[PDB]
């Protein structure tokens, strides 16, 4: 039992909880983000996660081959998932690049973000303690913006390529390449430390956050709903898609992981434990993040909703401030960023391993014919590094925000989840799926899972998509920069690169099948033996 929970401990915490959830919650007003979050959690997140693990165990193959055994017509779901993984692996590692840069900057007598007395610093800076005495800027925020990021005025100005961040990305990609090639993973005595360090660090950060003299206001802003005016399609999409992104579902990695699983240790129970604890760690770290934000609000004399960036930089603004107020701040900064690097590196290794496995399973005749697998891994790493170079430039923050919002999140995850649930519930058959689950694990899913797949998840996804289309608002970096029309088109192209996989595969298999149209569709709907 303890060993199983330890093996779980590798995968039920990640950057999606520590970093993504707090900034999405902050961007959507805080408390109002929680209601759709929990609604989607219990409506689809656990049922869809369980459904994908069931698919993976039932087929015992990749996320693309399983649909052949379920529904040949909708085999495009696996392709959409593999492109989602490919797009995610390009922009997810930029977080590790920023963490590596911060870790290298932490090897100093004094943390550079503690005070603003350097060459890269604006003359409008004022210390937070002395701020409550104009358009002043906190040293941490402008450090993040100018030294680590060197933020451009807009996406239309790429600027110069930051050599230091490029070397950080190169280092992280080489680490990933060597780990994948040599099969390096936490399996010996080191798994104890690898699993336990993140939660010890999160506990220390949370304790520091609560004991701040202004944590109460931050907690109140974190938990107080705003149903009067914050009910917008953006909050619904963000909360629903965060559930899918945190669990790594709709990506097809869960299917490949289930393939490895031989049988059921109450797979239902394992999925529920995974989901409950994965959501719990996010909700718990929200307290730490928002307590830090509330203390900064109390110290700087500004509103909680305006203290820090409403974007991916919230984790790189709030946490350094928290570690700045601990005894020997350099020590805790080093430990925090090492923890962040390990948490991101483990999930990066998992994702690149899954992507490589799926891509070689697509073409085993040449890719897997021999030692060319290592060359393929090197090729994938090189192309991903070159693609990530676009987000290293001075205007790379906007590209990163667009990629996060569209490429591996947003409408694409809703599309994939809706098609999976619709296929299994209606085309393949909910009764047949329950029969398969009985044969596998010994008991049927129950009314909750069956009704969720049949109605709740498709209705939620369709309603969110339609609500977004009717009440469409353009994506904005932070809360003041408006993206150009071409940037929005590029983001929608990134989303469509995954969304269009299902219709394209459908028409391709319809054309590549003999017989009349009805015979074609009948042959492609019937599951294979």
């Amino acid at each position, epitope marked *: 039992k303890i060993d199983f929970v330890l093996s779980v401990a590798g995968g039920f915490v990640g950057l999606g909880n520590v970093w993504r959830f707090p900034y999405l919650c902050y961007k959507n007003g805080g408390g109002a983000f929680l209601i759709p979050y929990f609604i989607f959690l219990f409506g689809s997140g656990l049922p869809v996660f369980f459904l994908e693990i069931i698919i993976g165990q039932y087929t015992s193959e990749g996320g693309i081959t399983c649909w052949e055994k379920i529904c040949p017509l909708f085999s495009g779901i696996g392709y959409a998932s593999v492109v989602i993984v490919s797009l995610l692996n390009v922009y997810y590692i930029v977080i590790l690049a920023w963490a590596t840069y911060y870790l290298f900057q932490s090897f100093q007598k004094e943390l550079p973000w503690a005070h603003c007395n350097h060459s890269w610093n604006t003359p409008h800076c004022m210390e937070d303690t002395m701020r409550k005495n104009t358009n002043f800027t906190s040293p941490v925020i402008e450090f993040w913006e100018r030294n680590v990021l060197s933020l451009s005025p807009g996406i239309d100005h790429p600027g110069s390529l930051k050599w230091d961040l490029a070397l950080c990305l190169l280092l992280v990609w080489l680490v990933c390449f060597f780990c994948i090639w040599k099969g390096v993973r936490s399996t010996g005595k080191v798994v104890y430390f690898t699993a336990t360090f993140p939660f010890a660090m999160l506990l220390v950060l949370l304790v520091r956050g609560l004991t701040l003299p202004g944590a109460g206001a931050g907690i109140k802003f974190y938990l107080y709903p705003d149903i009067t005016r914050l009910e917008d399609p953006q909050v619904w999409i963000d909360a629903g898609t965060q559930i899918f992104f945190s669990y790594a579902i709709c990506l097809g990695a869960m299917t490949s992981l289930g393939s490895y699983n031989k049988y059921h240790n109450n797979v239902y129970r394992d999925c529920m434990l995974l989901g409950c604890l994965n959501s719990g760690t996010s909700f718990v770290s929200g307290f730490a993040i928002f307590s830090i934000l509330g203390f900064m609000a109390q110290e700087q004399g500004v509103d909680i909703a305006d203290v820090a960036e409403s974007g991916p930089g919230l984790a790189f603004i709030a946490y350094p401030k928290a570690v700045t107020m601990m005894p020997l701040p350099t020590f805790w900064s080093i430990l925090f960023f090492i923890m962040l690097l390990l948490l991101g590196l483990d999930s990066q290794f998992v994702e690149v391993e899954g992507q490589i496995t799926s891509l070689v399973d697509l073409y085993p005749s040449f890719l897997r014919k021999g030692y060319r697998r290592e060359i393929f891994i090197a090729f994938v790493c090189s192309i991903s590094y070159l693609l990530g170079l676009t987000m290293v430039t001075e205007g790379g923050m906007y590209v990163f925000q667009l990629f996060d919002y569209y490429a591996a999140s947003g409408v694409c995850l809703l599309w994939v989840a809706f098609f999976e649930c619709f296929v299994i519930a209606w085309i393949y058959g909910g*009764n047949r799926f329950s*029969e398969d689950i*009985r044969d596998m694990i010994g008991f049927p899913p129950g009314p909750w899972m069956k009704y969720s797949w049949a109605v709740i998840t498709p209705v939620l996804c369709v309603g969110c998509f339609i609500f977004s289309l009717v009440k469409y608002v353009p994506l904005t970096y932070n809360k003041t920069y408006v993206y150009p029309n071409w940037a929005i088109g590029l983001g929608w192209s990134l989303a469509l690169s995954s969304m269009l996989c299902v219709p394209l595969v459908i028409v391709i298999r319809l054309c590549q099948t003999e017989g009349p149209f009805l015979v074609r569709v009948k042959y492609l709907l019937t599951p294979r033996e």
Partner: antibody
Amino acid sequence: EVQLVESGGGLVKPGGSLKLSCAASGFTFSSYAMSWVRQSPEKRLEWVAEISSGGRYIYYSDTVTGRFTISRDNARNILHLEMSSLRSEDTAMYYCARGEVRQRGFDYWGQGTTLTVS
Amino acid sequence: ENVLTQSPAIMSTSPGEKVTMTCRASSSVGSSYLHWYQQKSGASPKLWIYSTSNLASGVPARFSGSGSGTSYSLTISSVEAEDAATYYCQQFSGYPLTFGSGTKLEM
């Protein structure tokens, strides 16, 4: 579930054939799996075969893997067991049981009918 | 086939005294995949305990079960006159399904 009743038992000869039936009522027959359990005159229980809720997966015991055939009629809510090459050791009482949940076991058992191969 | 054997085939018993009977399995059986059935004389067997700890609807709290891995047992706190019946252990972890030898309580 309330009632499970078997029927069709009787006297046969070695090498003969017989079809056993199990009518079900009080529950949705199509949504619960069914199994046959055999009680020898020495009072020993032996499992015969299991059929899933939809009948897609079918399991047999080693002694009857190639001799007996199990079938169900979801529309009629009735369970059938077919015997082709009944031997001298097959004389016993057969009960049809509900085994939908493998972690819960056979919730209900039928009255059962005796089979003899004298 | 996973053969299950129950040692005390015949047990003479008097009212009030506690009685425990054990089931032995030749292969690893999961805790949730072992169940016991009670069969009165001249009657079909009825489920008594499932998952080695959960009591059926009809069985009173008088009965309880324990065991894991390869040895299982269920005990009676104080046997009554109505407790005289045959109990069989069954494994549901893997096919073919097998039942124990069975202990017929002799009053």
